Amino acid sequence: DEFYYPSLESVVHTFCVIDTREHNRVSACLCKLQVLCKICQTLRHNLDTEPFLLPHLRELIIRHLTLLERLSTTSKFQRILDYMKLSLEANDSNLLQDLAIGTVNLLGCQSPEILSIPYDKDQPVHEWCACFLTSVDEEALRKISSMLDNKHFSYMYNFKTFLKYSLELETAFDLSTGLNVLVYWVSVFKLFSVCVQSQFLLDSLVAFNALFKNHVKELEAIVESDTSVVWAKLSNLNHLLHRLQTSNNTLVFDEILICLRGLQIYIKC
Amino acid sequence: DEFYYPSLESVVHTFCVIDTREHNRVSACLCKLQVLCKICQTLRHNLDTEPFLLPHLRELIIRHLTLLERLSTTSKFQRILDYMKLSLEANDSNLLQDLAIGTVNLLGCQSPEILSIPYDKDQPVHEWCACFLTSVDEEALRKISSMLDNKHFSYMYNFKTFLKYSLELETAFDLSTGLNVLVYWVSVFKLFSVCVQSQFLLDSLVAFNALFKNHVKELEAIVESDSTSVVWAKLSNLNHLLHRLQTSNNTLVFDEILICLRGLQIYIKC
């Protein structure tokens, strides 16, 4: 269950756990520094991929719709699918609203009673998803809720993780599970659309880069409380951290990781 | 550990392994595909980075040189350090030779016997690393040359890996080992230089992309020679993905394909 970005709260909690369990304050700082190196590296990956995420998700719903075509029985049904599919190809300002009306209209065909629940423009995603999902056990709903109710975006699960749960929605290729998957992926698309327009990933990355600097500093000040190896390695870290403001790239993160491993091993003995 | 790219030869081995292990021809195809999906995905991650790789590696060496200046007993040693550093900054046509003669010469300061040792530019890089490493055990030599001797670029290790074995070399921090390390990074730099000059990662990405796309076609045939059939659906999906992959060769697509191959395994096992 990888994250697109983890919340600050999760990280502060992780740091506390580390503070409570490493004795050596220099170790502890170094653990936190690994943890932060990983995160900023993943987050850099995720940001470099970001400009492709919503195009990709558009095309994914289209495929899924394209698979739904095989289960069509009515000409209304297929016309809803065509509207949805085609919409997903262009930039209508109301794409996201139409994707949800669209999804409920499909659901209407197979079950007409559902159609006179009133469409709430501003109803939260996870609440829509919960509403229109059918025949899903309460453990799945929970997981889905933990993913879709992400505390006003304090975190965001990643694409691969949402794929993993879509596969668990599939357990015998009938229409209902078909429309379940559509609900899920439209939800997920709504959520990523907000998360990408607001640029939450950029924000998170800035914050955690800050946090990452603040611990390199914190590590110097800690070691300055005990001209050999440490001080070469610390100059490396410093140079690395330094270059990281020119070039936030994965290569730089790989050196920082091994540099950190560098110190941990030295300080063990 | 991890490869900048693997050899076809190794993958061909994993395949034959799979082929004899797996009950079904379908099952086998899918494993093969899962292996090829990871590999292609990793190789695209690597090729997006490659434009940054040589600049990074230079910048690393420059760093090691400044560090060695803390240990510059002599002013000759200093003058060479400066010369190597100016050379990495200029990134000239002569760089690699600048690096090699530099290194051999810093070494010569430590012990002059070293300077009578014959070598050339066409000599394989691992051979050169072996000569010029001082007192490292038959243990170190073995792994180094397995990294460095990559059998005429059949495979390449990635940077994370070369870093990893750098660490296991910073063992005793003297002039001596600070030169072993210089040597190793010069050697590594020369390998990646040739690798990037010669576009071996792109080559390997193209082959492995062919090899993945064509085994998807194989799987489709195979499956057929045996609407609400979730196989036929996943298969159709799989096909759309592969087709998109050829115009947007990107990590989100590989991720969708993986989940989809897993789906396909899960269903056929029944």
Author numbering:
A (entry chain A): 3 to 174, 177 to 230, 238 to 280
B (entry chain B): 3 to 174, 177 to 230, 237 to 280
Sentences from the paper on this structure:
As a molecular mechanism for the promotion of viral lytic replication by vPIP, it has been proposed that vPIP interacts with and sequesters PARP-1, thus disrupting the interaction of PARP-1 with RTA and reducing the amount of PARylated RTA. The results elucidate the novel molecular mechanisms by which oncogenic gammaherpesviruses overcome repression by PARP-1 using vPIPs.
Here, the structure of MHV-68 vPIP was determined at 2.2 Å resolution. The structure consists of 12 α-helices with characteristic N-terminal β-strands (Nβ) and forms a V-shaped-twist dimer in the asymmetric unit. Three regions, L1 (amino-acid residues 175–176), L2 (amino-acid residues 231–237) and Ct1 (amino-acid residues 280–301), were not visible in the electron-density map of the crystal, suggesting that these regions have high flexibility. MHV-68 ORF49 directly interacted with PARP-1 in solution without any other cellular factors; this action was found to be conserved in ORF49KSHV, thereby prompting us to propose a new name for MHV-68 ORF49: viral PARP-1-interacting protein (vPIP).
